[model samples]
Target: RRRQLIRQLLERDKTPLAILFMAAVVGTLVGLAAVAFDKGVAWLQNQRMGALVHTADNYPLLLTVAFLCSAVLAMFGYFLVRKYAPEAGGSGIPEIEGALEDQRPVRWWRVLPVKFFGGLGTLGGGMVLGRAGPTVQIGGNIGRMVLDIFRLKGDEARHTLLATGAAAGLAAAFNAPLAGILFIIEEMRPQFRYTLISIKAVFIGVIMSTIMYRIFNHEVALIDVGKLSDAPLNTLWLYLILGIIFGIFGPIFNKWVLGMQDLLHRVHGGNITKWVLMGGAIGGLCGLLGFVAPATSGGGFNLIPIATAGNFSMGMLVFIFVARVITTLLCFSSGAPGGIFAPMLALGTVLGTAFGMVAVELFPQYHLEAGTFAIAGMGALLAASIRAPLTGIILVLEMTDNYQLILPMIITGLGATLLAQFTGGKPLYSAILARTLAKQEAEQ
Candidate 1:
């Protein structure tokens, strides 16, 4: 009887109101999940640090313990992904994109659990990753999970719900509704079926996610760097120069990521034991780094404010940037369930600060601040790698609470995106999704 009713509904080509409604529900759930995810990681970090601090009450020992706790936390995350869901490694955004395109399977059964718990482990382990990618991926998985349970039919409803959930996930991750909308349009432009997108549905999902995000956590930018100086017309070239640097490096970074993944794949020969152990080693090392120097480990979000405040000399700042980049690439490329978003942002901050220092020295008339360059660099790497300038612009603004810096952000982002495109570089997420889809096709 249930199958008969489902057939009838499909035969009638029913409008997707029910699907959209379910999407709204998924959005609300995603918002709550993201908020909880944030709080959970914070709780774990605090618990570890607080326990160690209380024991030592000495700065040196406290720092040592901090690193040990982070290593353990990271190892736990790596172990799970290597053992269970390899596809859940890195940012899960590409997986979501692949699912929507029907080129990759959505093993929600595996991904949902792995991403939630695994993300908690790695992110909590204090490697440089962001929750936005995981949250977006989780939201999409929830949409599919609900759609399956309700026995919804037809491609239209299925596709709509998936897209809606993805948008909601992004909105919840960053608390930026408009960026969520733009992400779908920009990031998924190639595969997104235009007529079926139903902007109204996307808007509805975003609203629900935004509302839920606010309810759990008050409306505020994720980061709180004070508003920096704006880029004057004369300064546009400098922003472009920053973008050019990212543009040159973006493709190379992508290649490095892919090369690392392939090397790992060959070395393990798909053995679960080898993979999981590798994850543990990486995670443990990250934890150790955290214990030694808290600033050098963890998601880059925390490091942004300190770097932008010009608290470190240019040489030391460069050293931190180089160290974090290596760590970020290792943790992210080792098939761990984490996002590179925050790490890349941190890299951008360091590089921008470095450039700002040189600029201040060379061109004294501009009256530059390193913080201002932080904003520009914050979005440059994102735009160069993802090829989504608008989303990068809005995301940096949302994270840093700098609405006034949008113009410069846009200018930086656009310059990066354009240059990267000219260099024949593809967006990172799309490339990842393509690889996944190709593998799926070969297997099938």
Candidate 2:
């Protein structure tokens, strides 16, 4: 430990000027790439609803209009991906880890344009997908693009900037530099080399991305839940129970995610026409569902607060959770370009709020707030599902800006994480990476 610690400060021993400058470019350059992508996607979404706004709740006919708009929107994404780049599909995050090893080959030329444009189609179509993953995937590719471009011949350049882009994209997505830095620091420690180098690279990337975040008008917290609330120590026990319940769901959710992917490959039947049509149908349903339930639609980043604001009854929250689980499976498993982060967050908070509300009913004397649990359980599922306790808590902290809720969340979050791992759950990313590698090997 002492030996490594001494050498770790080797940043002081022999740091290169190239280190800081390259990472800075990776940060701001790919950071804007991600930011622009986010805006384009956001505009696409806005244009859909922006045009759809005139119905004045016109019901039956306008619903069909939404269906048509969304179906067309997502079909482009699915259609292009079905033919162009399968590796660019489905979160594309697992691909980043493998690419860092160069164990898996990557094509920035194909993936960059495909994912950026295709991301708009499916993500803007209002499926139960997310706003985070593709940005990171795109960022990673852009970093690698430059690595190959100017031709730095070291493993440091090959590795560091891709990771820098990755962390930067995440920061751009959530506007959470802290979580982005931690994601690079905490999650991919084993895959990428040089703790000191990558950390600084990630740090530089995050700072620039954050600076860019402000420029792009993201002044608000990533996942604000309206007003905040407090948690009494008396209610802490209920949080533990809530987390235990979440732990049980965690494994099941990961299992379902993989299983759904299996079903999609079969349903698509190895044909582009079949795949595009299937994507259209799924996107259409998402459209109609978004029309009907509005609560169960889109990436749930903004949706978190509506639920946290107590818009739905406890039973209704559960219903949305259940419905969303199906849609998450349908859209995510359909091999879309987006990811599961936003959907799972929605799932966790809904279930958490339901539990918290029930606790309020039973233990009324404590005067509990269901929204507090909404924030607390925000990251619990991620912990249990992905096995990253640090990412979950810090992400929740950044997303919600509820620093006071951290204590109870740790209790709840870790409770679920412990239970999930003890039950032998492979994290969502690891399992997805396994699937990608298996397919990669089969093709080779």
Candidate 3:
């Protein structure tokens, strides 16, 4: 009787059931992969810093060693991508975007290894990079791998599971399940089919990945900025102003990113050796900068809380923000395996804090805190650049647990979104994907 019932269910909903199972597996694997990647980078960083500490007596030697070490590591990243999988370079998010639209192939066998180790080399070299890009790509690739391995033939099942894996990857990286779910629904709306089972598969994937993350790391926010003061409804206009600033800056920033990419590409001229050397130089500069101003280097995750805690003066905030903007562009646009999300988030924090400080000076009666702006600005770049306000808002809320500021957050995000649209700013990922597809067609 049990066997007969199982057979009946399988005959009725074989594809959905198979997809659900694979989604769960993909989420679990992605969660583990994210944790492992973090640990690998951490271990490499410890070794590098530990050695540098011992050589602290010779300042020139220390600098040279740091530069050489980071250069070598970053070169490895560039070499792997150029040699094995060119698609693994950059943020890897655009490739996933292309894959989701079926405009790009999912060569998981090549991409998985290249992105994992290539990301390690660049990110672990102390460059301004984020893990989400690699994590999401790996998740999508893993989805494809699972489908191929299991011989899943249904197109609907294949597409749904791929989306599920990508969502799970985001959840695993940030420990924000709701953000993961909302990300697929909002950011990938054009590609994702909003079917009953597809949505349910995303939910299951997020749940599994979040659970796996918790099992390994415990229940902790990826970034805990502490609960911030509420944003009074009257003070909401300030957030709108901040959003306007980002809205104006968003397109300009995207243009700079593309400009830098073009400059680097022209210099490399499709030469692998030149690409690797250029990447090495950028990585070396970041390593040297790490010694001078650590906050200006790395993924900028560590700098977020410090910036929000009001540790720096307005002048210093602006200075670091400007410096990081340059480094962020240099590192990310060099075709290294890294993500721009964390660095951009840090930039937002600095800019927001600066604005908040100025606001406080102008209106002492309002009793405002810069941290609130930090939280609001946390998601503003993502809103304006990515054009996904809902995902940005929910990501901030999940990461910070600052529920009271939801209204202000939404207002700020929407303000950025509106102005970005008005200014004819395209979504960053979409632009990158378009460029990639054009290149592919040209090659063909």
Candidate 4:
């Protein structure tokens, strides 16, 4: 028996110590690369918005230039994707997920530049997308880039480093290392090569990426709403109800996103000029919305606190909720190189706030804080849409610095994910990647 145990240990030690050392190297490299991605995108965002605001001193030229410059930038992004690397479009999360499954190709050569620059163009042009998706994509590509340059042959190395980069990217994006690691394990379960030590690599990568992000951006939660109060256990059912509500909407949201994409494809008819013009129109509308009601525009990160402060009436909250939903869907489906993360969080907050207000009305004796619901709901939409409840819940908790609300957040997230799965809703990023890939294959 002792000899058998010795043999088992030897068999398990097939991988060399050097390989583990290389995993550390990969983690460090990916962390730096992911941090670079965040700063680079931030530079573009600052430049574009600064120039637009400076020119706006003259209202006529401001609007026109905003339309023109933004249109051109937006079109440049779309053109790159359609002409050179279509897979680089939308959130690159699904592509990473697919590639990990070996069901999809990575094409790092084309995707790296296309996603970096094209994403910069569209996102910096002031369209309603998040930078995190593209950042994560860039990080993954960089991982592959490193592998290719070094001629790393083993399948284990290739897969391990790719996941390392992705986790690092997410960690850098939010400054939440734990959440980043969880996102990989939960959200990209199919492609994530699960092993005890490989997971250690993910952890190492996230920690380094987070440190780099702090060095540059400083230690700040990506979205800060201050610490909100916890939801009482009695209020747990309300959160579950909130999850079910978003669960119903999650699949419907995916359908609407695809429908909008199809509509845009038909409208453009593969015409570059029409596409550019339409982009300008979208950008101008977003700019105009920014002025009309600050709540209705941007990534919705800026609006969460205000909405949760219980300042707006339930009716007003509802109006903004519906409005942002349309805006979020349109901007994302337009093939803008941004993330659905921020927008989805906004949706969850709106719905959560609405539910909390209703609850207050119904159970005046128990009393309630709508903000608690907001905290719980904040992650529910993400859980429902991405089918990654743990990540979503942790992300919101980390962002809000509200560890006390962990129970409610988990309850809501799990409820939403469970029902969303029951409703036959596919993960949003996976669906998008599949569509893009199917198109590419058909074209070939």
Best candidate (score: lDDT): 3
Which has the greatest TM-score?
A: 3
**lDDT (10s digit) by residue, model 1, range 45-69:** 7787666768667776766666667
lDDT of 4 by residue, 294-390 (tens): 5676667777887777777988898989888888877888776677876788888888888889888899766788888888899888888877788
Clashing pairs in 3: none
lDDT of each: 0.78, 0.80, 0.85, 0.76
Residue 59 of model 4 has an lDDT of 78
lDDT of 3 by residue, 1-444 (tens): 999999878766444677788888988888888888888888877778987998998999999878888889999999999999999988877888777777789999999999999999998889889888888888889889988998988767667778888888888888889998898888764554544337878888889888988887885555768877887778999999989988988888888998899998998899999999998999898888888898889878787888788888888898899999999999988989988866778888788888889888898888999888888888898898888889889988887888998988898888888889889899888999999889878898
lDDT against true structure, model 4: 0.76
How badly does each model clash, as a count of residue pairs? 5, 0, 0, 2
TM-score of candidate 2 versus the correct structure, residues matched by position: 0.93
Output the lDDT of residue 238, model 4: 81
Candidate 1: clashing pairs of residues: 66-291, 67-291, 70-287, 71-287, 126-298
- Which residue segments of model 2 deviate by more than 4 Å? 1-14, 53-60, 191-197
Q: Give TM-scores for every candidate, taking all chains together and pairing residue i with residue i.
A: 0.90, 0.93, 0.94, 0.89
After superposition, the stretches of candidate 4 with alpha carbons farther than 4 Å from their true spots are 1-37, 40-58, 191-197, 440-444
Q: How displaced is residue 390 in candidate 4, in Å?
A: 1.3
Residue 403 accuracy (lDDT) in model 4: 87
lDDT of 1 at 223: 73
